Amino acid sequence: MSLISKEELIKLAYSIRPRENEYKTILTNLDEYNKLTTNNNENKYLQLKKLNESIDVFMNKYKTSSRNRALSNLKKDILKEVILIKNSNTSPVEKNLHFVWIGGEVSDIALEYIKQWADINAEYNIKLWYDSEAFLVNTLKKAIVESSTTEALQLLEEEIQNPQFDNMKFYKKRMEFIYDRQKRFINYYASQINKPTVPTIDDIIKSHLVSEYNRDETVLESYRTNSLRKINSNHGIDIRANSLFTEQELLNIYSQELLNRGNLAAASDIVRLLALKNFGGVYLDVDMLPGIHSDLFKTISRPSSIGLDRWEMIKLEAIMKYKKYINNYTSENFDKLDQQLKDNFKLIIESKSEKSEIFSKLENLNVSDLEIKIAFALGSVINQALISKQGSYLTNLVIEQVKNRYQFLNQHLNPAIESDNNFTDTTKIFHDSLFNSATAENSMFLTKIAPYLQVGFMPEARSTISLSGPGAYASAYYDFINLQENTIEKTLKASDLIEFKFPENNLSQLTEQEINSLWSFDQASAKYQFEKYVRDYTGGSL
Amino acid sequence: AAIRKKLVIVGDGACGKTCLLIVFSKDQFPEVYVPNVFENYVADIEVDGKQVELALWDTAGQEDYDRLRPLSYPDTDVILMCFSIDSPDSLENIPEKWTPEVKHFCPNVPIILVGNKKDLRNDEHTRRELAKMKQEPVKPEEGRDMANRIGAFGYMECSAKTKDGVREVFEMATRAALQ
Ligand SMILES: O=c1ccn([C@@H]2O[C@H](COP(=O)(O)OP(=O)(O)O[C@H]3O[C@H](CO)[C@@H](O)[C@H](O)[C@H]3O)[C@@H](O)[C@H]2O)c(=O)[nH]1
Ligand SMILES: Nc1nc2c(ncn2[C@@H]2O[C@H](COP(=O)(O)OP(=O)(O)O)[C@@H](O)[C@H]2O)c(=O)[nH]1
Ligand SMILES: [Mg+2]
Ligand SMILES: [Mn+2]
């Protein structure tokens, strides 16, 4: 079905005044929508958006118009019409499972997590996306952070021994070296990248590590070829050979995260979007596990002691302890419970003969060609699991949110970076730029992106969320619901958001690997890490 | 409909602002970890016959964000000034850092003094490791006295883990915003 007819709106919006040109446009757009016989949902949505924009133009020019009454009601209709198109006709997603591991050799833990998915869903293609030119990025990051750690320890030699030493002073001091070294690498890269014998990222990294960090070339090449071999044997697919990057702007974003910042999670954020766009299907983080059978442990009642989150962890720990589907999976929390429950579990688990009787199959995940589903945690969105049809409008919206936020970040950050000051002074200039550009529309965003340079190297630096992560997804959701673009801080109500939830029964998020982020850490981990640094620095090594 | 009101939470780092916001907004306390989700806190509440939508703004209490905190302050309707019961140092900073900053940036905005982590006042480990630094947990009279000294609208204790007093905290903040 469609909206109200052209003549119906004329009727409903009758005035003494003659028809203003904006109103003629409104009627034309509404008609064109009604007369539209296109089975393409994107075309329908775009026509609706055009209509909505025309209405807005009218209601903003003639704010006192008597037509505003009806033009407001039609707007309420248009929203209802959006959902109507989304919910009406769904098909299953392309049966692709997308994973990303970039920057080095994929570990066996990740492979085992992927193995679970692939075993349960033998009909789905597994795509482990990697960058064939960037196997040494993690090595370079490791080298930079270790050099910086030693430099900061030696600097505060006289102080780190004091038990009342603030660890933040260590991390702040180290950041200065980290930034210096990042600049040095980037300047070298920028000089090397334009040689006639067009060098790869790995070539430049190798050269830089050999020159500046006393690394062995042969060892580095060995590691690189090993990484390539290992990933190619486990569903590996190269982003550089499948043309995921058509826009230079997206490649620039990806590269700035992969090279300038050494944030592999941010690079992953870009790649997953491009993959879901070009191919479609399901994206999963390497710390995500398939959903547990919906009522496999309903015979076992949760004790009053343990909360829900931990309860679920124990479930996983139990499964891994009696099935050994994944090597070296923890049992810490599972060990801390009485044999009454412990034994009970074992019976239920070992009773089942097939893996399918423990974990859930994805089978057909029915979605609309407009939408993208996202995982939920703490009643908010998180892009660790995604479902999207190829060329979905919403995915393109998210990609647009990312480009937009990177445009604003780079515009405000580039002058400071280029000033070639130390970390503090560059931060000062960047913050000044942010401060100067502050409005009541974007202030919360500026607060979030403020420690962008510190992400990965200092605790509580989680800017990635507001650039390439969940923040962009939430804004794109709001963008879509209200037929908008480039929304910054507007958010939806829960009822409107649950519409895009990743089915709970098809995902296990409380895995051992998830609780330890690979791109950020908190202050407690920073404290523990600093104490370990001091212990190992003072004790010596053999 | 509903009345829109802005709440901003301030206080020392680690005193439990984030967990409190999450507990109130989503009725969930993170027992294990805090996932890297999109941070947005909005809550509907009915107080004194009215229905109010509270926009909860979190802040970083650390000095690193001293110069950025003020971007969150404009158009604030109510401030939750927080301290942790298990951190006397946290309470001592209320009038050293937070009161002048809140006065300078949010003139005439009511302040609710919130003493967080109520469940640690009687905790054994807490008392033990506080005795080493020759300290003891904060008494309610200590907090009440501080509310009167700073001219706060009210004082309330809560425990985000047990959800004890959380509703009362936000209800009191709402009453302060409506006044
Ligand atoms: O060296 C690395 C490190 C990370 N990754 C990728 O980035 C992921 C991030 O996973 P994780 O370390 O668990 O990040 P989270 O802490 O779980 O953060 C969540 O919120 C962030 C907001 O951007 C996202 O980027 C994450 O995808 C999202 O799951 C991994 O799955 C990989 O895909 C790599 O490819 N190479
Ligand atoms: N015992 C107890 N611990 C808490 C409570 N609220 C928070 N915590 C812990 O204190 C830490 C700091 O909490 P957070 O909300 O991040 O404080 P913030 O630094 O002000 O954002 C968290 O890791 C919590 O586990 C509480 O009510 N009781
Ligand atoms: Mg916090
Ligand atoms: Mn994760």
Author numbering:
A (entry chain A): 1 to 542
B (entry chain B): 2 to 180
Reproduce, without paraphrasing, sentences from the article in which this PDB structure was first reported.
In this study, we used the same strategy to design a tandem RhoA (residues 1–181)–GTDTcdA (residues 1–542, strain VPI10463) fusion protein, where the two proteins are linked via an 18-amino acid peptide linker (GGGGSGGGSGTGSGGGGS). The co-factors, Mn2+, Mg2+, GDP, and the UDP moiety of UDP-glucose, have well-defined electron densities, but the glucosyl moiety of UDP-glucose has weaker density that is likely due to partial cleavage of UDP-glucose during crystallization. Here we present the co-crystal structure of the glucosyltransferase domain (GTD) of TcdA in complex with its substrate human RhoA at 2.60-angstrom resolution. This structure reveals that TcdA GTD grips RhoA mainly through its switch I and switch II regions, which is complemented by interactions involving RhoA’s pre-switch I region. Triggered by the GTD, such a movement of the switch I positions N37 of RhoA, corresponding to the glucosylation target T37 in the wild type RhoA, into the UDP-glucose binding pocket of the GTD, where N37 interacts with residues R462, S517 and S520 of GTDTcdA and UDP-glucose via hydrogen bonds.
TcdA and TcdB have modular architectures consisting of four major domains: an N-terminal glucosyltransferase domain (GTD), a cysteine protease domain (CPD), a delivery and receptor binding domain (DRBD), and a combined repetitive oligopeptides (CROPs) domain. TcdA, TcdB, and other members in the LCGT family glucosylate Rho and/or Ras GTPases at the highly conserved threonine residue (for example T35 in Rac1 and Cdc42, T37 in RhoA) using uridine diphosphate-glucose (UDP-glucose) as the sugar donor. Glucosylation prevents these GTPases from binding to their downstream effector proteins and therefore abolish their functions in many crucial signaling pathways related to morphogenesis, polarity, movement, and cell division.
